[PDB]
């Protein structure tokens, strides 16, 4: 339709699209310690071989 | 109106029309996999020959289970395509800018 | 939705917004012209009649 808010603010569902392109920001806060990744890879190999 | 820039509903209509065709091979692939599984179960039951009435029951029970899981697998397959029609995400790997 | 192609209301609504600013001077011009017409009618009536 017509009669849009050309000057004031983003409103309605244009905020939702921000969620859809802010979720990528939440997906990169999931930090991890590298040395824990190497530790767990090592213990995984050892437990997978077995005897 | 005379129009000034190319419209965006044409791209969505064409894509939706081509996307609706994928339903066929997916429902073929499900039946193919079910048939292969029933085959492998029938191979696995060849070792129970010394017990009649137990090879039949184990075939019947595992076959019935495998067949009954077909409905739920097909419902999920259909839904994953509906998900593809509902929203056109152009921010992916595409001709951005072009 | 997502921004593939430039929309046409991005042009139409900015133009419609700037065009509305024209009402004011257009009505000023009409007031000025009525001022002159009243002036001239007063000149004609002053000059001729006693």
Curated annotation (Swiss-Prot), chain A:
Residue ranges crossing the lipid bilayer per the database entry: none
Disease as annotated in the protein's UniProt record: Developmental and epileptic encephalopathy 31A: An autosomal dominant epileptic encephalopathy, a heterogeneous group of severe early-onset epilepsies characterized by refractory seizures, neurodevelopmental impairment, and poor prognosis. Development is normal prior to seizure onset, after which cognitive and motor delays become apparent. Developmental and epileptic encephalopathy 31B: A form of epileptic encephalopathy, a heterogeneous group of severe early-onset epilepsies characterized by refractory seizures, neurodevelopmental impairment, and poor prognosis. Development is normal prior to seizure onset, after which cognitive and motor delays become apparent. DEE31B is an autosomal recessive form with onset in the first months of life.
Record protein name field: Dynamin-1
UniProt modified residues of type Phosphotyrosine: 7
Family label: Belongs to the TRAFAC class dynamin-like GTPase superfamily. Dynamin/Fzo/YdjA family.
Location relative to the cell: Cell membrane; Membrane, Clathrin-coated pit; Cytoplasmic vesicle; Presynapse
Organism whose genome encodes this protein: Homo sapiens (Human)
Modified how: Phosphorylated by CDK5 leading to synaptic vesicle endocytosis (SVE) activation.
Domain of life: Eukaryota
Subunit-level organization: Homodimer; homodimerization is mediated by the dynamin-type G domain which promotes assembly-stimulated GTPase activity. Homo-tetramer formed from two dimers in the absence of lipid. Oligomerizes into a helical polymer that self-assembles around the vesicle membrane, when associated to the menbrane through lipid binding.
Domain observations: The dynamin-type G mediates homodimerization and plays a role in self-assembly. The C-terminal proline-rich domain (PRD) mediates interaction with SH3-binding partners. Is required for DNM1 self-assembly.
Residues represented out of the complete protein: 348 to 398 of 864
Function summary: Catalyzes the hydrolysis of GTP and utilizes this energy to mediate vesicle scission and participates in many forms of endocytosis, such as clathrin-mediated endocytosis or synaptic vesicle endocytosis as well as rapid endocytosis (RE). Associates to the membrane, through lipid binding, and self-assembles into rings and stacks of interconnected rings through oligomerization to form a helical polymer around the vesicle membrane leading to constriction of invaginated coated pits around their necks.
Position of the signal peptide: none
């Amino acid at each position: 339709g017509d009669q849009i808010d050309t000057y004031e603010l983003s409103g309605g569902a244009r905020i939702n699209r921000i969620f859809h392109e802010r979720f990528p920001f939440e997906l990169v806060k999931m930090e991890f310690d590298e040395k824990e990744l190497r530790r767990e890879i090592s213990y995984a190999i050892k437990n997978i071989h077995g005897i | 109106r005379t129009g000034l820039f190319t419209p965006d509903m044409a791209f969505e209509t064409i894509v939706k029309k081509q996307v609706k065709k994928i339903r066929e091979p997916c429902l073929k692939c499900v039946d193919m996999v079910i048939s292969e599984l029933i085959s492998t179960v029938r191979q696995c039951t060849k070792k129970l020959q010394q017990y009649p009435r137990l090879r039949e029951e184990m075939e019947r029970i595992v076959t019935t289970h495998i067949r009954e899981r077909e409905g739920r697998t097909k419902e999920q397959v259909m839904l994953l395509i509906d998900i593809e029609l509902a929203y056109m995400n152009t921010n992916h790997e595409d001709f951005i800018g072009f």
